[PDB]
């Protein structure tokens, strides 16, 4: 899969795109990969903010679903008109298929001013698609229509401009060290997961562990931060508080509300904790445990400063860049689970290094899901 290694790019905190193409001639866009949605988006009228968009006039292979679809989200929106086309991705397996595109006509808070990709490929389950499950995911379609394996995976890298590989119908064994330990999908809609501890810097939060998984834990490309539900958060900053109580912050610092700085090269690494999150093994009483670094969740803002970028949801865990960057992470649909490795190119230090370890011996795990 050489060809597909470091097909991914951006800048930091604007997500990771791919190049694609759509239709006939190809229109080359640049599309961010998001595994917390389902539709295939792009832009197809001039807004300021984009670098190009697509140009239905132009593709004899465009057809016309005649249908609307309109998504609200938590952050933004985007409506479109449905249709479909050939869809290639240039460093992707050598295939095109026809899917399903929403040409996007209006947005309000969904391009970002000054960055680089015009459109978002959710790589979730149909479930989740709008407007409703007969919509087919590209991923889907993919599949259906070609020999391409059913799995991805993703190396995301960060740093700024950041890279990393979208492994597309496999897995490359150079991206990662150590073993692949899967966790499964609970359900496919979003990437469902099952969190069943909770340590910092190896001392147990010792919640009722559905509290991390309240109403749901995700996987999602699509989110800087690790969002942690209300009362699993209060618990972890209470934590990481006392753990780096060496140094003292102001309380905006652990809600994101302001930076935090030293004199360049001497960030104290050291002085905060490591995290870990321990997932649902693949046998019954099992579990594996992924851990990450300060250099995961300490963000630069571009003298050192710095962003806490662990914070609150009311919409359950969510396992952001801030996770998959130290990890090697193994979109494994064909078995409905979810591997993770250390990955070859996540930022540590000479003392420490993202981790993922097992077996452990954890009960009642099944009940640590929400219903
Ligand atoms: N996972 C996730 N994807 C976002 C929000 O969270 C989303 C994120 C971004 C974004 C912004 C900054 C950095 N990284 C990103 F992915 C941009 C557009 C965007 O746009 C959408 C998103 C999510 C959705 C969803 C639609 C219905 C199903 O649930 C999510 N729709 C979008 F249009």
Request: glycine fraction near 8%; proline fraction near 5%.
């Amino acid at each position: 899969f050489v060809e597909m290694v470091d097909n991914l790019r951006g800048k930091s905190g604007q997500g990771y795109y791919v190049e694609m193409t759509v239709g006939s001639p190809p229109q080359t866009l640049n599309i961010l990969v998001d595994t917390g949605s389902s539709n295939f988006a792009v832009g197809a009228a001039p807004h300021p903010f984009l670098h190009r968009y697509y140009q239905r006039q132009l593709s004899s292979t465009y057809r016309d679903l005649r249908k609307g679809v309109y998504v609200p989200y938590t952050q933004g929106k985007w409506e479109g008109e449905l249709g479909t086309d050939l869809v290639s991705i240039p460093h992707g397996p050598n295939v095109t298929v026809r899917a399903n595109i929403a040409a996007i006509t209006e947005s309000d808070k969904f391009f970002i001013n000054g960055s680089n990709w015009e459109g978002i490929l959710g790589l979730a389950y149909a479930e989740i698609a709008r407007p409703d499950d007969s919509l087919e995911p590209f991923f889907d379609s993919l599949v259906k229509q070609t020999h391409v394996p059913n799995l991805f995976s993703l190396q995301l890298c960060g740093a700024a401009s950041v890279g990393g590989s979208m492994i597309i119908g496999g897995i490359d064994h150079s991206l990662y060290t150590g073993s692949l330990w899967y966790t499964p999908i609970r359900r496919e809609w979003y990437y469902e997961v099952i969190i069943v501890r909770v340590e910092i810097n190896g001392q147990d939060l010792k919640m009722d562990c559905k509290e991390y998984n309240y109403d749901k834990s995700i996987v999602d490309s699509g989110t800087t931060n690790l969002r942690l539900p209300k009362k699993v958060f209060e618990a972890a900053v209470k934590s990481i508080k006392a753990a780096s109580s060496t140094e003292k912050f102001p309380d905006g610092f652990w809600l994101g509300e302001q930076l935090v700085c030293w004199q360049a090269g001497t960030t104290p690494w050291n002085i905060f904790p490591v995290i870990s999150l321990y997932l649902m093994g693949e046998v019954t009483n099992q579990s594996f445990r992924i851990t990450i670094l300060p250099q995961q969740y300490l963000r630069p803002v571009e003298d050192d400063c710095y962003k806490f970028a662990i914070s609150q949801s009311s919409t359950g865990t969510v396992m952001g860049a801030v996770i998959m960057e130290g990890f090697y992470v193994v979109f494994d649909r064909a078995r409905k689970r979810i591997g993770f490795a250390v990955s070859a190119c996540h930022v540590h230090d000479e003392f420490r290094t993202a981790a993922v370890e097992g077996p452990f011996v954890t009960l009642d795990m099944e009940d640590c899901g929400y219903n």
